[PDB]
Amino acid sequence: TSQIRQNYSTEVEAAVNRLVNLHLRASYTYLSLGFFFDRDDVALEGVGHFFRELAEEKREGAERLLEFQNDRGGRALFQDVQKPSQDEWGKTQEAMEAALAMEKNLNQALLDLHALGSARADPHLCDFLESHYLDKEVKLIKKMGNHLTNLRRVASLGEYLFERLTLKH
Amino acid sequence: MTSQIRQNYSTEVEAAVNRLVNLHLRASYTYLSLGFFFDRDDVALEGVGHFFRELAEEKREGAERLLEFQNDRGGRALFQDVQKPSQDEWGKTQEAMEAALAMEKNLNQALLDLHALGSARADPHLCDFLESHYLDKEVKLIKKMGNHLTNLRRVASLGEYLFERLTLKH
Amino acid sequence: TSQIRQNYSTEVEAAVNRLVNLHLRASYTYLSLGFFFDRDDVALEGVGHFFRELAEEKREGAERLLEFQNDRGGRALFQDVQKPSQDEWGKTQEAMEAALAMEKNLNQALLDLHALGSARADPHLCDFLESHYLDKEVKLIKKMGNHLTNLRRVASLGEYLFERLTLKH
Amino acid sequence: MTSQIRQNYSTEVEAAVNRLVNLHLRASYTYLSLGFFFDRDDVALEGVGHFFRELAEEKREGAERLLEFQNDRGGRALFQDVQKPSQDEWGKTQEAMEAALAMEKNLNQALLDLHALGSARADPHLCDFLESHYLDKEVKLIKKMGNHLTNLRRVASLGEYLFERLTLKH
Amino acid sequence: MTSQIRQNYSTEVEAAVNRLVNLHLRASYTYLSLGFFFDRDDVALEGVGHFFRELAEEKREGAERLLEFQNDRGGRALFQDVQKPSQDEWGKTQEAMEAALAMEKNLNQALLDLHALGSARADPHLCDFLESHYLDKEVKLIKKMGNHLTNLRRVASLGEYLFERLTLKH
Amino acid sequence: MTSQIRQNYSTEVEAAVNRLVNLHLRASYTYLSLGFFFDRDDVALEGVGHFFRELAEEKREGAERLLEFQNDRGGRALFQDVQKPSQDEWGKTQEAMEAALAMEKNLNQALLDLHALGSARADPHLCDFLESHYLDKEVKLIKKMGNHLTNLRRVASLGEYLFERLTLKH
DSSP states (O other): OOSSOOSOOHHHHHHHHHHHHHHHHHHHHHHHHHHHTTSTTTOOHHHHHHHHHHHHHHHHHHHHHHHHHHHHTOOOOOOOBOOOSOSOOOSHHHHHHHHHHHHHHHHHHHHHHHHHHHHTTOHHHHHHHIIIIIHHHHHHHHHHHHHHHHHHHHOOHHHHHHHHHTSOO | OOOSSOOSOOHHHHHHHHHHHHHHHHHHHHHHHHHHHTTSTTTOOHHHHHHHHHHHHHHHHHHHHHHHHHHHHTOOOOOOOBOOOSOSOOOSHHHHHHHHHHHHHHHHHHHHHHHHHHHHTTOHHHHHHHIIIIIHHHHHHHHHHHHHHHHHHHHOOHHHHHHHHHTSOO | OOSSOOSOOHHHHHHHHHHHHHHHHHHHHHHHHHHHTTSTTTOOHHHHHHHHHHHHHHHHHHHHHHHHHHHHTOOOOOOOBOOOSOSOOOSHHHHHHHHHHHHHHHHHHHHHHHHHHHHTTOHHHHHHHIIIIIHHHHHHHHHHHHHHHHHHHHOOHHHHHHHHHTSOO | OOOSSOOSOOHHHHHHHHHHHHHHHHHHHHHHHHHHHTTSTTTOOHHHHHHHHHHHHHHHHHHHHHHHHHHHHTOOOOOOOBOOOSOSOOOSHHHHHHHHHHHHHHHHHHHHHHHHHHHHTTOHHHHHHHIIIIIHHHHHHHHHHHHHHHHHHHHOOHHHHHHHHHTSOO | OOOSSOOSOOHHHHHHHHHHHHHHHHHHHHHHHHHHHTTSTTTOOHHHHHHHHHHHHHHHHHHHHHHHHHHHHTOOOOOOOBOOOSOSOOOSHHHHHHHHHHHHHHHHHHHHHHHHHHHHTTOHHHHHHHIIIIIHHHHHHHHHHHHHHHHHHHHOOHHHHHHHHHTSOO | OOOSSOOSOOHHHHHHHHHHHHHHHHHHHHHHHHHHHTTSTTTOOHHHHHHHHHHHHHHHHHHHHHHHHHHHHTOOOOOOOBOOOSOSOOOSHHHHHHHHHHHHHHHHHHHHHHHHHHHHTTOHHHHHHHIIIIIHHHHHHHHHHHHHHHHHHHHOOHHHHHHHHHTSOO
């Protein structure tokens, strides 16, 4: 009943609310990962920083979806944000393998929303996802793959040198 | 004879582009009318005038960008009469903005219909042109007009004066 | 019944509304001319630019008349803007001959409005037209005449060189 | 096994810090909800939106500072679900700010309860951390919210519009 | 042994990307040939040479961006021979630009065919990549080549000299 | 007809210049393949990728300078197919750099053979062109590749990672 709502399906509106929740859950997971690597008994500041920066990127992704929801005349509906899947994240390689799986899951959710937009002929939604999400996800997944290949190469002394010489401080 | 440049450009899309030019010029003309109406001595809402005069220029630029697209794809611009605006007098700010919102939703629907035609004819250059330069601009403008109407309803007159003074740009 | 209206005849008010329409029709004609010369099969960018600049000048002329109408307490009344007289404009020389005829017609309409102002003793109108329209029209008609003389001189290779060496890009 | 750094840091304070993290994240999430609610086209109070969006970030920073403290003292961060906000729709500015004031007083009481626990366990580093970074910030924010509610009551609507225009930052 | 990163990236798209890399390299090589031909002492049209040399670099950049895309999606670049250009001598400016326009329309058709494959395989990242970096670039270049050919026909030699002096950049 | 400018320029040198253009283009293409191989997600040695991508551009510039020389002397550029690179996958950094060193020594031998032909045909402008723009560049590049291989052998993997991080430019 929004005065502005036009060509905006209830199915897309609900899927947007679910994708907000998925972004907030990813942000929360990266917050957990970020602080884990700053424990005195882990102490990999570059790994901490990498995950803390991703926590902020995923939260910005959620906020952009909420702005889209308001711009199209849908109604934001919030759900609980589930705690992250682990309390302790293991070595850098295991943490980045978990991050890569979570990003591929988020990318699949974005591609599923794009498919719904295409099926409901909502080209504003298609363009929003292509402009702000799909290439960002491809570039981030590629960067995580590159990191995992280098962590496998240096496999520990190798994990220290990866944090010192690849990751930003 | 067919343009030396024309490629993957349907005659139906070419004709629809010419109609969208006319719809943009008609919207521009309506906003010009609205703009000067609010600058009458017996209406005298300069911020409302300015809002509509800026939209008259934005819709004219939308028309010009479509004409450039028509030339870039090798179609032929065909102009029709630009119909005079639907009203001579536009009433209070709220009634004028309700008219503007209906006009923008109509223009948005015309853009979405052209996008559907492009998608059916597999003209991805057209789809990307509309998505890049029109569809998000229409969403943002319709949202801003909605916000304005909610605030005009809230202040409903003294409220109309304060809206023009404290929300609209001069 | 305007609180401001003074020495402003209904005849002048109606003639101002007609001159607005004539300026908008001239603007629309120049818009058509401007895009015609940017067709891939015409491709005279300087001629396109010349007409696009005139489209904006004629629209500004209409807007100035509307501001005058409001300043004097008249009421703007809009009519349909008739489509331009041609869909295709021929060579540069033929297009500029059509433009010169249209400007002389607009100049005659301005001189007719000045005559009406003089007959109705509306010196504010006389001064408005003299300050903002009559000399502009004389200078533009002179410039169009100069252009036509040069297009006749170079009469094609000549039309190309005129666009390259006389017209602005 | 106990951290190599842990010193004078009770397991009860460690657990209370984890709960205060969750309370700050829940407050952040509530303010995010409030922030986007006031930017709906049918609410359209941008200054109210901005006020709550800025508080969402301040509460998230409060959570992050507590997690840094947990690591600095050799405790272990343990995360729980962040409960969704108590409302989906927040009503007029005054009702939303009354909800925010009650949430801030609840958070302030949680901080004061943690300070009492620190004082009982003689953890002066914790007492000073809360005093330096939380307790005065909560006092100042609660005072500002009180001032806002007094002005919203004064202008009680046209008054709600003028409060958003003339008191709140854009 | 499927890439750790590969997601929603069909073997058909992967193969078509490798073919489009080869088509871009062949276009680059053709423009290199055109560029040096116009700088022969017995042709000596520096502006025409520069036009084609710049296009050789643009088409090579197009190939490199496709190879970066292939790596970003987890596909594997497979290179083939780059076929020598279709002519050794390119005739007058007008004949060379007619051959260039035919080659660009062929490349644009290959880009549109890849977009159709992306649309059929629901690979929206591919669709957006082509729309953002290739399809509008091709439309604008084809339009520019059409404009050039119209002016070369107009001045048809002394005309070809004046076109190179007064239209083309040095 | 002979060029109006051609002087002291043998048909043998003209043909050998055309072959050396093709050899430079094939070396460029090989380095392009190496450059993208090392940017695969499952190789991910950005400094190695950068090293080869920079060489791809240097070899292409070498080809372009030979084509400019061909035109300056009044010869006629004749292009052949550019053969695809000898491998699709290049192995570890050390194996790729061993393949690059063998390819550069082959290119250096072709440059020395062209110099010998110039000396035999008493073409001192050719001799000076090769000495000034090619022979010292090849010696310096081969020396740098030898240095790289010695360091890759020293650090032989963790060593390969550290070489890319601490020796190669990003």
